[PDB]
């Protein structure tokens, strides 16, 4: 025959075999400026009927579709009505009284008591000091350095709010200089501070404000049942069943219940930052003005945001056989003869918005950033489905995330179901929410999908998580075993990893571990460089079951004991002398549980590591700093000098140090104090 | 000698001196987070490449004296220190043997897990569509008689007695747990930091939201990969001093002290000691008897 | 902070602070710092006047603990912990009794040692600044000032401390410990809060120039400034705006449900054009092997020596000929490169010091094949702007190709059982739990039906070849290295074999990035005549190199042996993708186990002996002219493994998109089969999204044909 | 194995559609399979070449005319593979063509062996 794996769905329901419709297990081995231009053009086209203004601070053209013409077709529209958004927010507050006030009270603490180092946690971030993407910590250090070079010294208190005050103060001065000695005027600095690099990253000036906004949004979402974003694992599978139970508990069953397996692909491009500003303004009513101000800055800078085009285009010449790179910065004056038909149309339609090498993108939002706030906006529409709001025989409820949504509509008859679906769709349009009527479908309640969670008559399958790596981690062979078994155990608990699949992942990990560390079992014929030592250890050992895998021992790991460190697991089966050798504190070589053994060995801005040198020097004077956060009102120099003086004094009297060395230490301490007064 | 020389070197520079002289000890957790990145160039491939070559591991200079240069078979074990993993296997095979008696006490929680699993009982496995409920379940069961802060103080007075703060040093009465932990770990050589981390695991309670369809006794939560899955439930039963701060350092009362010599100075004598991870303070022994009681009654007299 | 203060202070002080704040008219939820500061002030005042009494005669005592003896004055008067009016009345009464001077400002305590009022102060900043501020504010009166700090500092008026050193030390220690606790909790941000003399200000985050102006341009139209917008939002009620806007909204804006019936779906439209051609990194079903039964000696070894042995085992090399030219490259260069490979392998039999890795001489044919012939130079646009034929790199649409039948042949052979094992998995601990026994049963049944699989051979082939390529690229960055294509297996008699498929010649691999391309030439043995499906070999130059001699019952029959040669390229990401092909076994086992578990949730029992061990049960996994064909459980396992391996082996964005969209179409079809009355909103749009990724990829086109067969048979 | 799979595939072709000479082609394919089995039996009998002398006296004509229908069958299979557009038929016919090309050479070497 001809094998057709798709025919398996003729016997097995789609949901039970849906796992076979996911091609990859991990990031595929494949991956531009043209896409960025397409995104900008689409974003401005969906909202082209709004007002046009030129920024007085940047000179960038800006498009404002808020309160624009109402749509008259089923195309994406950014014309979100301010009054409609505010009414939805008011009704959300009404259905959950005290939600916004309580969220603001909870968030003020985070705003007041957050440290600047909170801003080092994240993926690559755009670095305005270098016009390049950098790690969060490096970008933060660079920003702090450049701010210090200028008269901006307020983040030297360990508060994110003080660093954000520095950010606000930076935009006031008329000159910003970067030493590596570049000079930036006010307009160029503003343009680089509002730049979103490239699936997009903001600079190290919008990240703190975004963080506070997202904290407030998480606080709000934690109190909403329809919010499916913040939770994840087997408690989202609870939400999927809970909504169906809510919508299916009918008395004298006559109503019809239909479920929309919704899709909202590319719905961020119709999310205007101005509506998010209105959202935050309504959420923070009757709150301190400082809190309103700090929460009302990220949308302010997103309304003025600007997309960096990226690398650019590359050209080819078949005659002279040469290549050139054309940076997007100079792609505003190039003659359009070189470009392709599609590309020259893009470059022509985006030229008006190009300024200082970046496109001006006021309308819309990019993936990420305001995920929680968009979830709040969606739950606002889901909140309007209550009969008290839909004053009709039909009502709806559902789940909301930043990527997908689910809707359940209940009505006495099919016409009522159509009326409910139409009303939900039209209310979504009034708030700039564009349902994708290309990837959405409706069926009677009993089966639906939500963020790769497939529900079928009470059974939910979680296929939203990529099967993780089950190879070595690249650390000592003692830590790799612990990490490998812990990853499997954690996937069994959180990502619905099957027992048999977990056992075979254990087998593959043990194979990879043995081939990386050449620790094949002592009774095998495999001949590595390490085979002789391992075989000698195998022969000399009476109990060939307490030997670790690192020592050519057996693998005793199974499902029941994935939570137990290997050394403890094999402790009772160990030879006493092998214990004494392996677990010898005086050996030459040295979120997981591992016992320190001989296998815990170690293998092979003018000063980037300046910050990671004073801390390491402090840890030598105060070893407890590696376990607990240091506390003290004195300086680093005073602490270390006093420690050295006391230690040298006690050490000289103990005889471990001669008098001359003690005098030398005291002299160096005096010199260090002298340097302390410069 | 080396540490102070490195400190002098750092403060010779214009930038590092600024950090050292301006950053207080409080704001180090912040500074420690200013690091670089982009180092994981597929570290598994790096480890394979490193294990492919000889002498991948780093050992102390004593390696040359404890372990012979060449194997019984003629295989080189170390070189100028850069060491082969065959040296690790050699040490595990015929290296020095010591008494591993502290390990059951330091790693008591891991051995508790081992004992619980060893004597546990398995019932049948039931296939249903059970519902798991999100609950605050404690992953690590801390000591019942110790609060979160009291547990940290015990870990601090037993592992780093020389860096205890004014809260520990100025509070009369010592917990019995600290007294027994000090004698249990009197001669322990494992490591101060590993000991501190295991003590934290043993003494401090940790809690998380897990969706669980059964017990939450901290013994049913460790075995959760084993007891519950997508569509099945596995029946399982687990086996079983006082001082007073007077002000900043005073040079009239001699040099500074560490927190071990305060044990014998005098009753009511003034001395200055380096407490915690920083500032030196002038302290005495509390001459009078001060205790905490129902001070509300005393204050109501006004 | 609010939680902290209710834990560091006794109930009476917290109650007094709350009463004082209520009297002043502030909420502790918004001014937690002021609450903490006032609580700290009260406690210090109480500690000041504690255990101190005036002796019956002209003397003072410090008797502590309960003192029922009486006859002793308290030595102090509490004025801070009282109402404004009551405090003023008490102050006036005591001043009149002692005839002192009434202070202009409210005092804190009164001392009987001297007829003076003591104002206590706790500062979260430098002590001398606070003392100077108090002196400037409090002047021209006989008033005493005592200042405490959180750092242990202290000063009073004229260095006249009016308490025993022990009590002052107690206050200092209390403040010091409070400071440490706040710093540990991260609440010591109140250090600045009390920096303005009065600790009542709240945080101030202002919006000013260049941000007040940006703010006024980032708000809905018809509003001039952000303050007017805030005023509008603050006064706002749900007057019913959504209903009015919906009334004004055009009826063309609708989500109409179009029924999805048995006859609405149509077959997906696949492209027209020239048939697709093979694009994998190695031959799959046309691959030939030269094998040696290496006598144990496990542990890899030297792949070059194994290749040399496998080559020596073969006799039959003839004069190379081109039987199917590449038509896009110089064909004589390909047989020149093959001859060079042969000669170089013959040279290793000299040079007494046998090499572990071989490097090929950089000749003209080998430089041309490996793209060494200079690539276009990195000139600057400022100079080459007048080259006329200067266009974009791609500037070309993707060509449309029709599905050919060889990609179904490949998948048919991938799902078959071979004679070797191709995988040996490590052991795990013995099972004690019933669920562990079920897991072992499923895992063993799966592994037994998948070890001797052709798709499992492809996994090992890809892993080995990509590992060798990555090692050569990293270690031999600047030379042409010969890399044998080798895999290992076990026969039914449990005997190790080393197999040689061909040779890869790597180019110059200076890979800074993970997407940098390293060129290589692959040379793979085969018994397949390229002239039967010449369209499948569009990118290959095929040579006839020898005459393999195959044993048969009638006799030993000779067949021609070919060499499929093609230039190819790869990067670090692609090599790593190849090295991780063992995850396909995990994916297929996970899929089978998900099937078992879904059927187990229903029926509330373990459906593991019903999938396996039940020979009667068969699944539809194929198609013939008779119709749908049924297969056994193990054959389903092998088919799923082959599907996963081909997904990894032909990975492309087209495959990802097609899977994403055909999943939705499949779910709609299932809903139709479940009698759940499915409906759509734009089915044509979904079909367009599905068919926009059907261009030229053999795997994606075969998957589309599979879906078309499923659509034909499911709605029937 | 190849004969078994190819004949199984051709049987599906025979019943899914009408028997457009496929029935005769299949009959021929089993005839050739049994013929090759007889050749293998004689090759095993090679232990006694004396009887193989008379068997070869028969094999002269038998081989000649069997080779005749084998070549003409290969031509027919090529013709069918050239005109068919159905993937199942294309795969079946390519497998059959390869098998016939192999078997032709097998019988050719046997013919040279017995001369």
Torsion of CA A27, A31, A37, A38, to 10 degrees: -70
Q: Does B75 touch chain A (CB under 8 A)?
A: yes
Helices (DSSP H) in B95-220: which residue ranges?
103-106, 108-118, 148-159, 166-169, 176-184, 192-203
Contacts of A319 in chain C (CB under 8 A): 387-389
Residue labelled with tokens 């030269």: C290
Residues sharing a CB contact under 8 Å with residue D22, sequence separation 6 or more, in sequence order: D10, D13, D14
Instruction: Name the token pair of A107.
Output: 């968030």
Q: Is residue B7 part of a domain?
A: no
- CB-side neighbour CA atoms (13 Å) of C140: 3
Question: In a 10 Å sphere around its CB, with 0-12 CB exposed, 13-18 middle and 19+ buried, how is residue A270 labelled?
Answer: buried
Question: In a 10 Å sphere around its CB, with 0-12 CB exposed, 13-18 middle and 19+ buried, how is residue A470 labelled?
Answer: buried
Q: What span, in angstroms and rounded, lies between the C-alpha atoms of A357 and A359?
A: 7
- Asked if C714 lies within 8 A of A9 by C-beta distance, the reply is yes
Determine the straight-line distance between the first and last CA of chain A, rounded to whole angstroms: 88
Nearest in space to A627 (alpha carbons), one of B193, B191, B149, B106: B193
Nearest in space to C450 (alpha carbons), one of C580, C574, C579, C591: C591
From the CA of A8, how many Å to the nearest CA of chain D?
19
Instruction: Name the token pair of B103.
Output: 């390990």
CB-CB neighbours of C596 under 10 Å: 22
Strands (E), A445-509: 447-450, 453-456, 459-462
List the single residue in A with minimal CA-CA distance to C593: A498
Contacts of A125 in chain B (CB under 8 A): none
Let me know: does C607 contact C600? Beta carbons within 8 Å: yes
Q: Is residue B206 part of a domain?
A: yes
Question: In a 10 Å sphere around its CB, with 0-12 CB exposed, 13-18 middle and 19+ buried, how is residue A10 labelled?
Answer: middle
Contacts of C165 in chain B (CB under 8 A): 246
Q: What span, in angstroms and rounded, lies between the C-alpha atoms of A515 and A527?
A: 11
Let me know: does C343 contact C321? Beta carbons within 8 Å: no
Q: Does C372 belong to an annotated binding site? A: no
Contacts of B71 in chain A (CB under 8 A): 532-533
The angle formed by the CA atoms of residues C32, C33 and C36, to the nearest 5 degrees, is 85
C176 closest CB neighbour out of B226, B232, B245: B245
- The rounded radius of gyration (Å) of the Cα atoms in chain A is 31
CB-CB neighbours of C461 under 10 Å: 23
- CB-side neighbour CA atoms (13 Å) of C613: 8
Contacts of D86 in chain A (CB under 8 A): none
Edge-first strand listing for the sheet containing B270-274: B243-248, B280-285, B270-274
Q: What span, in angstroms and rounded, lies between the C-alpha atoms of C120 and C81?
A: 13
- Asked if D12 lies within 8 A of A2 by C-beta distance, the reply is no
From the CA of D9, how many Å to the nearest CA of chain C?
8
Are residues B185 and B112 part of one domain? yes
Q: Does D84 touch chain C (CB under 8 A)?
A: no
Q: What span, in angstroms and rounded, lies between the C-alpha atoms of D92 and C409?
A: 10
Q: Does C171 belong to an annotated binding site? A: no
DSSP A306-350: EEE--SEEEEEETTTTEEEEEEGGGTTTS-TTSS-HHHHHHHHHH
Strands (E), A520-664: 602-603
How is residue C361 annotated by DSSP? Answer: -
Secondary element (H or E) of residue C636: helix C633-649
Contacts of D110 in chain C (CB under 8 A): 554-555
Contacts of D91 in chain C (CB under 8 A): 405, 408-409, 412
Contacts of A2 in chain D (CB under 8 A): 87-88, 91
Let me know: does C216 contact C226? Beta carbons within 8 Å: yes
Q: Does C670 touch chain A (CB under 8 A)?
A: yes
Instruction: Name the token pair of A38.
Output: 């397409």
Residues sharing a CB contact under 8 Å with residue C132, sequence separation 6 or more, in sequence order: none
**Helix and strand totals (H; E) in chain A:** 23, 22
Q: What span, in angstroms and rounded, lies between the C-alpha atoms of B178 and A602?
A: 33
Please give the resolution of this entry in Å, rounded to 1 decimal.
Answer: 2.5
List the single residue in A with minimal CA-CA distance to C652: A30
Which residues 2-41 in chain A show a CB within 8 A of chain D?
A: 2
Beta bridge partners of C258: C680
> Which domains occur in chain D, in start order?
1-10+65-115 (1.10.287)
A:D CB pairs within 8 Å: 5
Residues sharing a CB contact under 8 Å with residue D6, sequence separation 6 or more, in sequence order: D29, D92, D95, D96, D99
Residue B171's domain spans which residues? 105-237
- Three-state SS letters, chain D: CHHHHHHHHHHHHHHHCCCCCHHHHHHHHHHHHHHHHHHHHHHHHCCCHHHHHHHHHHHHHHHHHHHHHHHHHHHHHHHHHHHCCCHHHHHHHHHHHHHHHHHHHHHHHHHHHCC
Are residues B281 and B176 part of one domain? no
Q: What span, in angstroms and rounded, lies between the C-alpha atoms of C286 and A8?
A: 28
Instruction: Name the token pair of B143.
Output: 């000591």
Contacts of A342 in chain C (CB under 8 A): none
What is the separation of C-alpha D6 from the centre of its chain, rounded to a whole number of angstroms?
11
Mutate one of A513, A537, A582, A628 to test the B interface: name it (highest B CB count within 10 A).
Answer: A628
Contacts of B243 in chain C (CB under 8 A): 173
A608 closest CB neighbour out of B24, B36, B193: B36
Instruction: Name the token pair of C398.
Output: 């993707």
Q: Is residue B79 part of a domain?
A: no
Q: What span, in angstroms and rounded, lies between the C-alpha atoms of D14 and A100?
A: 74
Q: Does C120 belong to an annotated binding site? A: yes
CA distances from B171 to A142, A250, B161, B243 (A): 44, 64, 14, 7
From the CA of C539, how many Å to the nearest CA of chain A?
21
Residue labelled with tokens 């002789």: A532
List the domain boundaries for chain A: 82-303+368-450, 477-582, 608-676
The angle formed by the CA atoms of residues A591, A592 and A596, to the nearest 5 degrees, is 125
Q: What span, in angstroms and rounded, lies between the C-alpha atoms of A543 and A566?
A: 16
Q: What span, in angstroms and rounded, lies between the C-alpha atoms of C673 and B160?
A: 69
Q: Does C119 belong to an annotated binding site? A: yes
From the CA of A208, how many Å to the nearest CA of chain B?
15
C604 closest CB neighbour out of B128, B236, B247: B128
Torsion of CA C299, C304, C308, C311, to 10 degrees: 90
Q: Which residues of C301-333 are buried (b: 16+ CB within 10 A; e: fewer)?
A: eebbebbbebbeeeeeeeebeebbbbeebebeb
SS3 C518: strand
Looking at the structure of chain B, the number of domains it has is 2
- Asked if B54 lies within 8 A of A529 by C-beta distance, the reply is yes
Contacts of A1 in chain D (CB under 8 A): 9, 12
Mutate one of D10, D77, D109, D113 to test the C interface: name it (highest C CB count within 10 A).
Answer: D109
Residues sharing a CB contact under 8 Å with residue C124, sequence separation 6 or more, in sequence order: C37, C149, C150, C190, C191, C192, C193, C194, C195, C199
List the single residue in D with minimal CA-CA distance to A1: D9
Q: Does C516 touch chain B (CB under 8 A)?
A: no
Neighbouring chains to D with at least 3 Cβ pairs closer than 8 Å: A, C
Instruction: Name the token pair of C619.
Output: 């699944």
Q: Does C553 touch chain D (CB under 8 A)?
A: yes
Q: Does C64 touch chain B (CB under 8 A)?
A: yes
Mutate one of B2, B15, B30, B63 to test the A interface: name it (highest A CB count within 10 A).
Answer: B30
Q: What are phi and psi of A619, to 5 degrees?
A: -60, -25
Nearest in space to A421 (alpha carbons), one of A258, A640, A254: A258
Q: What span, in angstroms and rounded, lies between the C-alpha atoms of A440 and A406?
A: 10
Residue labelled with tokens 């696949």: C270
Q: Is residue B93 part of a domain?
A: no
- Three-state SS letters, B184-251: HCCCCCCCHHHHHHHHHHHHCCEEEEEEECCCCCCCCCCCCCCCECCCEEEEEECCCCCEEEEEECCH
Are residues B212 and B114 part of one domain? yes
- Asked if B278 lies within 8 A of A551 by C-beta distance, the reply is no
CA distances from D13 to A510, C410, C453 (A): 49, 20, 27
Determine the straight-line distance between the first and last CA of chain C, rounded to whole angstroms: 69
- Asked if A583 lies within 8 A of B100 by C-beta distance, the reply is yes
Q: What span, in angstroms and rounded, lies between the C-alpha atoms of B199 and A251?
A: 57
Q: Does A204 touch chain B (CB under 8 A)?
A: no
Let me know: does A559 contact C435? Beta carbons within 8 Å: yes
Strands (E), C342-449: 358-360, 377-378, 390-392
Residues sharing a CB contact under 8 Å with residue C11, sequence separation 6 or more, in sequence order: B296
Mutate one of A204, A631, A656, A675 to test the B interface: name it (highest B CB count within 10 A).
Answer: A631
Residues sharing a CB contact under 8 Å with residue A479, sequence separation 6 or more, in sequence order: A473, A592, A594, A600
A:C CB pairs within 8 Å: 498
From the CA of C294, how many Å to the nearest CA of chain D?
29
Q: What span, in angstroms and rounded, lies between the C-alpha atoms of C309 and C102?
A: 112
From the CA of A12, how many Å to the nearest CA of chain D?
25
Q: What span, in angstroms and rounded, lies between the C-alpha atoms of C130 and C196?
A: 10
Strands (E), C51-205: 53-54, 60-61, 76-78, 109-111, 116-123, 143-149, 154-156
Let me know: does A283 contact A103? Beta carbons within 8 Å: yes
Nearest in space to C462 (alpha carbons), one of C522, C528, C548, C415: C522
Contacts of D9 in chain A (CB under 8 A): 1
Question: In a 10 Å sphere around its CB, with 0-12 CB exposed, 13-18 middle and 19+ buried, how is residue B110 labelled?
Answer: buried
Q: What span, in angstroms and rounded, lies between the C-alpha atoms of C501 and C461?
A: 9
Q: Is residue B98 part of a domain?
A: no
Nearest in space to C218 (alpha carbons), one of A57, A285, B224: A57
C:D CB pairs within 8 Å: 55
Let me know: does A532 contact B75? Beta carbons within 8 Å: yes
How is residue A400 annotated by DSSP? Answer: E
Let me know: does A47 contact A434? Beta carbons within 8 Å: no
Let me know: does A115 contact A159? Beta carbons within 8 Å: yes
Residues sharing a CB contact under 8 Å with residue C339, sequence separation 6 or more, in sequence order: C320
Let me know: does C480 contact C370? Beta carbons within 8 Å: yes
Instruction: Name the token pair of C503.
Output: 């040779």
Q: What span, in angstroms and rounded, lies between the C-alpha atoms of C528 and C524?
A: 11
Q: Is residue B86 part of a domain?
A: no
Helices (DSSP H) in A65-206: which residue ranges?
82-95, 99-112, 136-149, 160-170, 186-193
Q: What span, in angstroms and rounded, lies between the C-alpha atoms of C645 and C578?
A: 10
Q: Is residue B8 part of a domain?
A: no
Nearest in space to A28 (alpha carbons), one of C655, C513, C586, C700: C655
What is the separation of C-alpha C158 from the centre of its chain, rounded to a whole number of angstroms?
66
Residue labelled with tokens 């004494």: A580
Instruction: Name the token pair of A276.
Output: 């998010």
């Amino acid at each position: 025959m001809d094998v057709n794996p798709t025919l398996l769905f003729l016997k097995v329901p789609a949901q039970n075999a849906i796992s076979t419709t996911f091609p990859y297990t991990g990031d595929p081995p494949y991956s531009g400026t043209g896409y960025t231009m397409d995104t900008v053009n689409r974003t401005h086209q969906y909202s082209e009927k709004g007002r046009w203004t030129t920024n007085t601070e940047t000179g960038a053209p800006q498009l404002n579709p808020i309160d624009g013409p109402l749509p008259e077709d089923n195309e994406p529209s950014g014309y979100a009505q301010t009054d409609c958004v505010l009414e939805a927010m008011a009704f959300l507050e009404e259905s959950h009284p005290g939600i916004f006030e309580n969220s603001c009270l909870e968030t003020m603490e985070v705003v007041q008591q957050t440290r600047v180092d909170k801003l080092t946690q994240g993926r690559q971030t755009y670095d305005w000091t270098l016009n390049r993407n950098q790690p969060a910590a490096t970008a933060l250090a660079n920003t702090i350095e450049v701010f210090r070079s200028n008269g901006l010294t307020a983040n030297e208190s360990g508060r994110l709010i003080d660093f954000l005050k520095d950010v606000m103060e930076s935009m006031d001065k008329e000159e910003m200089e970067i030493t590596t000695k570049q000079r930036l005027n006010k307009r160029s600095y503003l343009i680089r501070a509002l730049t979103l690099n490239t699936i997009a990253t903001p600079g190290m000036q919008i990240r703190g404000f975004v963080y506070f906004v997202e904290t407030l949004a998480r606080s709000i979402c934690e109190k909403l049942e329809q919010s499916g974003l913040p939770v994840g694992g087997n408690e989202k599978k609870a939400k999927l069943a809970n909504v169906v139970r809510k919508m299916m508990t009918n008395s004298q069953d006559t109503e019809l219940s239909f479920t929309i397996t919704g899709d909202n692909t590319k719905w961020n491009e119709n999310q205007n930052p101005r509506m998010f500003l209105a959202m935050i303004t309504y959420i923070t009513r009757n709150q301190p003005e400082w809190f309103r101000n700090v929460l009302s800055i990220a949308p302010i800078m997103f309304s003025n945001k600007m997309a960096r085009l990226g690398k650019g285009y590359m050209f080819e010449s078949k005659s002279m056989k040469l290549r050139t790179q054309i940076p997007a910065e100079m792609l505003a004056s190039i003659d359009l003869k070189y470009f392709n038909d599609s590309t020259r149309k893009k470059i022509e339609k985006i030229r008006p918005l190009l300024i200082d090498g970046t496109a001006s993108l006021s309308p819309g939002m990019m993936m990420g950033m305001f995920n929680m706030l968009s979830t709040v906006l969606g739950v606002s529409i889901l909140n309007l489905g209550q009969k008290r709001y839909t004053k009709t025989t039909y009502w709806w409820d559902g789940l909301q995330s930043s990527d997908d949504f689910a809707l359940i509509v209940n009505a006495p008859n099919h016409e009522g179901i159509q009326a409910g679906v139409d009303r939900f769709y039209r209310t979504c349009k009034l708030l700039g929410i564009n349902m994708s009527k290309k990837k959405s479908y409706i069926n009677r309640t009993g089966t639906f999908e939500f963020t790769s969670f497939f529900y079928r008559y009470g059974f939910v399958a979680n296929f939203s998580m990529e099967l993780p790596s089950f190879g070595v981690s690249g650390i000592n062979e003692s830590a790799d075993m612990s990490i490998g078994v812990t990853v499997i155990k954690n996937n069994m608990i959180n990502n619905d990893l099957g027992p048999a699949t977990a056992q075979m992942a254990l087998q593959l990990f043990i194979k990879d571990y043995r081939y990386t560390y050449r620790c094949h079992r002592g009774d095998t014929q495999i001949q590595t460089r390490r085979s002789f030592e391992i075989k000698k250890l195998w022969e000399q050992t009476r109990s060939k079951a307490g030997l670790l895998v690192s020592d050519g021992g057996p693998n005793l790991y199974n499902i029941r004991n994935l939570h137990i460190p290997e050394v403890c697991l094999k402790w009772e089966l160990m030879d006493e002398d092998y214990q004494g050798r392996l677990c010898n504190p005086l050996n030459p070589f040295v979120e997981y549980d591992a016992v320190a053994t001989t296998h815990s060995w170690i293998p092979k801005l003018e000063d980037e590591q300046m910050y990671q040198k004073c801390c390491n020097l402090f840890e030598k004077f105060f070893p407890s700093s590696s376990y607990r956060r240091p506390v003290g009102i004195s300086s680093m120099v005073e602490a270390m000098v006093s420690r050295a003086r006391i230690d040298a004094r006690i050490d000289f009297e103990s005889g471990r140090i001669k008098k001359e060395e003690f005098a030398e230490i005291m002299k160096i301490c005096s010199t260090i104090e002298e340097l302390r007064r410069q | 000698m080396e540490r102070i020389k490195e400190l002098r070197d750092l403060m010779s520079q214009s930038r590092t001196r600024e950090i050292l002289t301006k950053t207080t000890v409080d704001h180090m957790a912040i500074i420690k987070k200013y690091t670089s990145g982009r180092q994981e160039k597929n570290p598994a491939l790096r480890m394979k490449w490193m294990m492919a070559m000889k002498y991948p591991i780093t050992a102390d200079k004593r390696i040359m004296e404890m372990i012979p240069e060449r194997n019984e078979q003629g295989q080189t074990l170390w070189s100028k220190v850069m060491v082969s993993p065959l040296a690790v296997t050699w040490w595990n095979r015929n290296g020095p043997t010591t008494s591993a008696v502290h390990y059951p006490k330091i790693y008591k929680t891991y051995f508790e897990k081992v004992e619980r699993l060893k004597h546990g009982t398995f019932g049948p496995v039931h296939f249903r569509n059970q519902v798991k409920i999100r609950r605050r379940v404690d992953i690590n069961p801390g000591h019942a008689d110790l609060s979160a802060k009291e547990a940290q103080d015990v870990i601090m007075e037993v592992v780093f007695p020389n860096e205890v703060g004014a809260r520990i040093l100025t509070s009369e009465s010592q917990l019995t747990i600290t007294k027994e932990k000090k004698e249990e770990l009197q001669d322990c050589k494992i490591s101060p930091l590993m000991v501190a981390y295991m003590l934290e695991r043993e003494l401090v309670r940790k809690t998380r939201f897990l969706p669980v369809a059964g017990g939450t006794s901290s013994v049913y939560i460790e075995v959760l990969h084993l007891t519950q899955g997508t569509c099945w439930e596995q029946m399982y039963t687990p086996g079983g001093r006082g001082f007073l701060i007077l002000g900043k350092e005073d040079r009239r009362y001699g040099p500074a002290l560490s927190i071990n010599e305060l044990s014998n100075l005098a009753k009511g004598e003034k001395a200055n000691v380096l407490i915690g991870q920083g500032d030196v303070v002038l302290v005495m022994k509390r001459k009078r008897d001060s205790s905490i009681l129902t001070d509300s009654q005393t204050a109501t007299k006004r | 902070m609010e939680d902290f203060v209710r834990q560091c202070f006794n109930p009476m002080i917290v109650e007094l602070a709350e009463k004082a704040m209520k009297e002043y008219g502030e909420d502790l939820k918004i001014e937690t710092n002021k609450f903490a500061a006032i609580c700290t002030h009260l406690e210090v005042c109480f500690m000041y006047s504690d255990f101190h009494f005036i002796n019956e005669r002209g003397e003072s005592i410090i008797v502590e603990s309960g003192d029922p003896n009486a006859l002793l004055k308290h030595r102090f008067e509490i004025i801070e912990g009282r109402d404004r009016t009551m405090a003023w009345t008490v102050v006036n009464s005591i001043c009149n009794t002692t005839g002192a001077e009434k202070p202009k400002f409210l005092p804190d305590l009164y001392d009987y040692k001297e007829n003076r009022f003591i104002e206590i102060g706790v500062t979260r900043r430098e002590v001398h600044i606070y003392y100077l501020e108090k002196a400037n504010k409090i002047k021209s009166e006989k008033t005493h000032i005592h200042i405490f700090s959180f750092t242990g500092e202290e000063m009073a008026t004229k260095a006249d401390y009016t308490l025993d050193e022990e009590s002052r030390a107690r206050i200092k220690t209390r403040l010091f410990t409070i400071r440490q606790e706040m710093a540990s909790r991260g609440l010591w941000d109140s250090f600045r809060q009390s920096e303005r003399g009065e600790e009542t200000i709240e945080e101030r985050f202002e919006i000013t120039g260049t941000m007040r102006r940006l703010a006024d341009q980032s708000l809905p139209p018809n509003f001039s400034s952000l303050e007017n917008f805030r005023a509008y939002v603050d006064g706002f009620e749900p007057n019913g705006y959504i209903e009015g806007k919906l009334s004004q909204m055009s009826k063309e804006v609708n989500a109409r449900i179009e029924p999805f019936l048995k006859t609405t779906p149509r077959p997906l439209r696949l492209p027209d054009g020239p048939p697709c051609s093979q694009r994998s990194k190695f031959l799959l079903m046309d691959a030939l092997k030269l094998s040696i039964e290496d006598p144990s000696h496990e542990g890899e070894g030297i792949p070059l020596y194994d290749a040399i042995k496998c080559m020596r085992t073969f006799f039959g090399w003839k004069e190379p000929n081109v039987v199917k030219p590449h038509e896009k490259g110089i064909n004589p260069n390909y047989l020149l490169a093959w001859k060079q490979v042969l000669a170089e392998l013959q040279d290793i039999e000299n040079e007494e010091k046998i090499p572990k890795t071989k490097n090929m001489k950089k000749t003209s044919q080998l430089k041309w094949a490996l793209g060494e012939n200079m690539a276009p130079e990195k000139v600057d646009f400022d100079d080459c702007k007048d080259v006329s034929d200067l266009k974009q790199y791609d500037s070309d649409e993707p060509e449309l190709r029709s599905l050919a039948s060889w990609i179904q042949s490949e998948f048919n052979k991938a799902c078959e059982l071979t004679d070797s094992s191709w995988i040996e998995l490590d052991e795990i601990g013995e099972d004690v739990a019933p669920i562990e026994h079920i897991a072992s049963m499923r895992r063993n049944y799966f592994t037994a039906e998948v070890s001797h699989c052709r798709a499992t051979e492809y996994i090992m082939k890809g892993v080995y070849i990509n590992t060798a390529l990555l090692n050569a690229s990293c270690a031999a960055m600047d030379d042409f290295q010969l890399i044998p294509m080798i895999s290992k297996c076990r026969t039914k008699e449990g005997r190790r074999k080393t197999n040689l498929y061909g040779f890869i010649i790597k180019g110059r691999s200076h890979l800074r990035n993970d997407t940098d391309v390293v060129n290589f030439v692959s040379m793979e043995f085969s018994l397949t005549d390229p002239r039967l499906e010449p369209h499948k070999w569009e990118k290959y130059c095929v040579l006839e190199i020898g005459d393999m001699l195959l044993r048969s019952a009638i006799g030993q029959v000779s067949r021609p042996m070919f060499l499929y040669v093609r230039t190819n390229g790869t990067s670090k990401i692609k090599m790593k993708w190849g090295m991780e092909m063992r995850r396909c076994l995990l994916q297929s086992l996970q899929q089978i186990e998900s099937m078992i578990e879904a059927e187990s949730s229903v029926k509330e029992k373990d459906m593991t002996k019903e999938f396996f061990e039940n020979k009667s049960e068969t699944w539809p996994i194929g198609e013939s002219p008779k119709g749908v064909e049924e297969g056994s459980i193990g054959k389903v396992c092998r088919t799923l493994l082959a599907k996963s391996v081909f997904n990894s082996l032909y990975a492309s964005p087209q495959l990802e998109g097609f899977s994403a969209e055909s999943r939705k179409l499949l779910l709609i079809v299932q809903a139709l089969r479940d009698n759940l009355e499915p409906g759509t909103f734009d089915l044509g749009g979904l079909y367009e999204a599905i068919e926009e990724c059907l261009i030229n990829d053999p795997w994606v086109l075969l998957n589309a044909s599979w879906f078309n067969s499923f659509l034909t048979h499911a709605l029937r | 194995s190849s004969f078994q799979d190819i004949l199984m595939r051709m049987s599906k072709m025979q019943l899914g559609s009408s028997s457009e000479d496929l029935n005769g082609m299949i009959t021929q394919f089993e005839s050739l399979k049994l013929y090759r089995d007889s050749l293998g039996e004689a090759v095993m009998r090679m232990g006694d070449l004396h009887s193989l002398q008379n068997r070869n006296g028969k094999w002269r004509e038998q081989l000649s005319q069997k080779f005749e229908e084998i070549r003409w069958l290969i031509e027919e299979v090529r013709h069918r593979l050239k005109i068919t557009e159905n993937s199942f038929e294309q795969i079946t016919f390519m497998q059959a063509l390869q098998l016939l090309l192999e078997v032709e050479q097998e019988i050719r070497t046997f013919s040279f062996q017995l001369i």
